[PDB]
Each structure stands twice: as C-alpha cells, then as structure tokens.
Amino acid sequence: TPLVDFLMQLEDYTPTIPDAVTGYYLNRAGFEASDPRIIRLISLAAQKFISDIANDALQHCKMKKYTLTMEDLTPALSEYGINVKKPHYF
C-alpha cells in the first residue's frame, strides 16, 4: 500500500498551502483537524489539481509566451469538461 506509506511520511513536509488555510476551508465544510497529516494530503491533492491545469495551459500558450490568459485557460479546461467564462461585463 503506497498511499498509506506516503501519508506516514507527512509529519515533516510543509506543503505549498498552509494548514491554517487548508484547515480553514475544511472547517467550513465540517471537516475538523483530527490529524494534521490528513490536511497535508488534501492540500497536496488541491495543489496537484491546480498544477495540472497550469501545466496544460502552458502547452496552449507555447503554440500561440510566459503569460497566462483566459484564452489559454479556455482550451485547457475544455478537455476537463469545464467551460470557463469570460467576464465581459466590467
């Protein structure tokens, strides 16, 4: 079981999101901080989701860089099945 062996190595390894901020949005939904390593996995699973979108929007920016636009997020989230919306009203 790799994922049990992974979570037992998270007493160290402060992640990119703090546990005072990941734990705040977990307490907002009823998830209470029993184990602080449990928070760090949820903070890691939410990093990997945002990182996979920013890594795939970079491929849609190299073809057309070093700049993240809404026309790069639009085809990047389209394979995810997420239709992002332009503001268009400001």
Binding site: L77, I82, N83, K85, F90
Partner: peptide
C-alpha cells in the same frame, strides 16, 4: 457562477463564492 458543468459531478450544488470581479 462563471462555469457550468454539464456532467454535474465535480461541482454539485455547492457554491464557489462567486467571482471577485469589478467594472
């Protein structure tokens, strides 16, 4: 608000707090 999921499963009726946008 700002995106609509036709499959409904990653974002059910839980809200995302809107979009902090201005004129």
């Amino acid at each position: 608000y700002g995106f609509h999921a036709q499959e409904f499963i990653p974002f059910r009726f839980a809200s995302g707090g809107g979009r902090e946008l201005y004129f």
